Structure formats: structure tokens, C-alpha cells
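Design job #97: recover the sequence.
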């Protein structure tokens, strides 16, 4: 499976839509509790995780740490905004595979998803 964790419904729908159109089965979550429950239900192949997760008990990086602690082999790709490159590089230092910055194109998203799925 491939889990998309983002409180921003528009970006989450766009990401899930692009990946589903490419032939991947997608699952969505909107915070730390919904994401952790979805992974414990069935471990996904890949996770796309928003760096903020506004309204969540745990923000994107605090959730990344939790996912990495519980599932070290599970690749996590961050999704960030303009001016967040230092937070995205901090996420890579903490185990994130990569990051994608908004506004992003579909081919870029599929490429990073592809690249993350090969390292196994």
C-alpha cells in the first residue's frame, strides 16, 4: 500500500489522485492518530507525509520520527512549501527518503514515488 498523510485535503486529493492514475492503491490520513492507525491496520509500502499536519497531536516531523521508530524500513517522503527547505533537510537527517515542494508537477511526484519504492 501507499499512504498519503496531509491535513490539506486539496493537496492530499491531488497527490492520491496522481498516484492512483499511475496504478497505485492509495489510502489517506489527516493527522498523527489517523496515520498511525492506518499503518498498524496494514503497513503501507510508502508514505507521503506533510511537514506541518496542522491540527494534529504530532506535526509532520514528530510523526516521521514515530513512523521511523515503529517501522524503520518504511520509506517516508515529505511534502513541504516555499521556505521550508531547511525543515525538509532536517526530515532527511531524521530518516525521510526525500521531499517534494509545493507547487509540484505530477511527473516529479511519480518519479520520487518510483525511486522510493525501488530501495527495498
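Job complete. Output follows.
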Amino acid at each position: 500500500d501507499i499512504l498519503v498523510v496531509d491535513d490539506e485535503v486539496d493537496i492530499r486529493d491531488l497527490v492520491a489522485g496522481i498516484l492512483s492514475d499511475e496504478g497505485h492503491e492509495t489510502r489517506t490520513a489527516f493527522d498523527a492518530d489517523s496515520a498511525l492507525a492506518a499503518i498498524n491496520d496494514r503497513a503501507p509500502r510508502l508514505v507521503f507525509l506533510d511537514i506541518w499536519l496542522q491540527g494534529s497531536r504530532l506535526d509532520g516531523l514528530a510523526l516521521l520520527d514515530e513512523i521511523k521508530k515503529q517501522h524503520p524500513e518504511l520509506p517516508v517522503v515529505m511534502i513541504s512549501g516555499h521556505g521550508n527547505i531547511e525543515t525538509a533537510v532536517s526530515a532527511i537527517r531524521r530518516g525521510a527518503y526525500d521531499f517534494i515542494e509545493k507547487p509540484f508537477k505530477a511527473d516529479r511526484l511519480i518519479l520520487v514515488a518510483e525511486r522510493a519504492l525501488e530501495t527495498s
